[PDB]
Design a protein around this ligand. Structure first.
Ligand code: 87U
Ligand code: GDP
Ligand code: CA
Ligand code: MG
Lengths: 424, 57
């Protein structure tokens, strides 16, 4: 288990997905045209996880770019690292999806889905040992939400034994393109509960607040939100992209993070938050990454309990001090970690720091407080759905009101399931 | 179902339109038929006027 196949779908999916390949190509010493110009052998030791090797010693990302309109994928190709992607993997339709799940999942995207799967099969074929798939998308629009979940369901049929992980950006009125986002997100959440092994709940509410309150940016762009996202995307892929005596793949990590199959929605976090000179001490990283203010999903971890936690510290620091600090927060806040999963906080350290920061820490929390996120989208859904508002956009593409009623019920069940383990 | 309903809408728009345009042609022709029939009734009256002058001499 070494190779991962990456898929990015929709405007959002392709935006944050482009930033992921920008950050990690820098970390691995791969330039905009694909050639290696690093110094450490650690940068090439597990480069096969995310890159294929080409003639002339060129490195090409194992990345498939999906969208139902050309716009954003033309911006990817024009952008800084766009030349590195394999041209055959740019798979795109023409008519768009108008922020419509139905268009993505049932009509427009159905016409394009099979040619995306042909490129997946092409990449999966020449993979010594495929460990699984990772996907970047929003749940608020049409393509990434509707088609992205359709792809996830098709990929599971053809590859039922492989791990499916997602970075799924959650919509919020604070950063809102259309009023129908709650509808699209609710329909998508039901898909992820069934068909993904882990889903990283990037909440645009949370990214906005971190940009506004804790970074003092008055008018935050999508780039300021995406800056925070890419820092986390790098962090969660660190232990696969480098050593350091850690013998873990996506499945091994999934096995240790997911105690119940439906409850695989994580609360990501990063320290320090940036947009510095003084490097943080190990105690600061530990307090910040556990702090609610640094959470990428707008939930209060004090309102739930941690099922499992994973933390990956980057930089040259004392592993003794890391152990001490990680043990300090658990033993001084032990009510918020479930007693019925012993030793549920696990940690790793990587010597190579990310670009700019001398030492950082990425937080992966499977907390029952994520019900707050799903309750918020459930409230927005019902506000509109009780008056069948904006439904004509979906019934026009063939959908029934029943499918909405099902999806409403499936997410409220997930909320109830999270509540069960919060009181146990 | 999306195709079925999109086709139904095209079908019934076409049938609703053809029914109105044929119903309109019936109504217009019948309105003009009645106008001429009233005018042709005046020619039959004017023929009786001209006969009752010659049949009174
Ligand atoms: C002992 C220690 C601390 C290492 C540990 N013990 C349990 N856990 C851990 C740590 C991890 N556990 C994970 O499950 C994990 C998941 C992972 C890995 C790779 C990719 C993606 C992913 O969703 C993705 C990323 C970018 C993107 F574009 C789209 C999707 C997730 N990463 C970890 O570092
Ligand atoms: N964080 C972040 N969110 C985005 C970005 N672009 C769009 N969104 C969010 O994604 C949703 C719109 O979906 P989008 O990806 O544009 O639609 P699609 O292209 O049809 O998949 C909204 O909830 C937006 O707030 C981005 O670059 N970054
Ligand atoms: Ca078409
Ligand atoms: Mg958009």
């Amino acid at each position: 288990m070494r190779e991962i196949v990456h898929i990015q779908a929709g405007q959002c999916g392709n935006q944050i997905g482009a930033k992921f390949w920008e950050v990690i190509s820098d970390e691995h010493g791969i330039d905009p045209t694909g050639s290696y110009h690093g110094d450490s052998d650690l940068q090439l030791e597990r480069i096969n996880v995310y890159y294929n090797e080409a003639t002339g010693n060129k490195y090409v990302p194992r990345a498939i770019l999906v969208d139902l309109e050309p716009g954003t994928m033309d911006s990817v190709r024009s952008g800084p690292f766009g030349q590195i992607f394999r041209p055959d993997n740019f798979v795109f339709g023409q008519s768009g999806a108008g922020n419509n799940w139905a268009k993505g999942h049932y009509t427009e995207g159905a016409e394009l889905v099979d040619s995306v799967l042909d490129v997946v099969r092409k990449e999966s074929e020449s993979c010594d040992c495929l460990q699984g798939f990772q996907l970047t998308h929003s749940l608020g629009g049409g393509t990434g939400s509707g088609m992205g979940t359709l792809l996830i369901s098709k990929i599971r049929e053809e590859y039922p034994d492989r791990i499916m992980n997602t970075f799924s950006v959650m919509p919020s009125p604070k950063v809102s393109d259309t009023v129908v986002e709650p509808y699209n997100a609710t329909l998508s959440v039901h898909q992820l509960v069934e068909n993904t092994d882990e889903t990283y709940c990037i909440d645009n509410e949370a990214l906005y607040d971190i940009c506004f309150r804790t970074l003092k940016l008055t008018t935050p762009t999508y780039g300021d939100l995406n800056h925070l996202v890419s820092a986390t995307m790098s962090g969660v892929t660190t232990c696969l992209r480098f050593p350091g005596q850690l013998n873990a793949d996506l499945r091994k990590l999934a096995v240790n993070m997911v105690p119940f199959p439906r409850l695989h929605f994580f609360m990501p976090g990063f320290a320090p938050l940036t947009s510095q000179y003084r490097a943080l001490t190990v105690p600061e990283l530990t307090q910040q990454m556990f702090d609610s203010k640094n959470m990428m999903a707008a939930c209060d971890p004090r309102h739930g309990r941690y099922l499992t936690v994973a933390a990956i510290f980057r930089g040259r620091m004392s592993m003794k001090e890391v152990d001490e600090q990680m043990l300090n927060v658990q033993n001084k806040n032990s009510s918020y970690f479930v007693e019925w999963i012993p030793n549920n906080v696990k940690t790793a350290v990587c010597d190579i720091p990310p670009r700019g920061l001398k030492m950082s820490a990425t937080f992966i929390g499977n907390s029952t407080a994520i019900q707050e996120l799903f309750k918020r989208i459930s409230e927005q859904f019902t506000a509109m759905f009780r008056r069948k508002a904006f439904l004509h956009w979906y019934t026009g593409e063939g959908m029934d009101e029943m499918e909405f009623t099902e999806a409403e019920s499936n997410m409220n069940d997930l909320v109830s399931e999270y509540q069960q383990y919060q009181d146990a | 179902k999306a195709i079925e309903e999109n086709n139904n809408f095209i079908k019934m728009a076409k049938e609703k339109l053809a029914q109105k345009m044929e119903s309109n042609k019936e109504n217009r022709e019948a309105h003009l038929a009645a106008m001429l029939e009233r005018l042709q009734e005046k020619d039959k009256h004017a023929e009786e006027v001209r006969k009752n002058k010659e049949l009174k001499e």
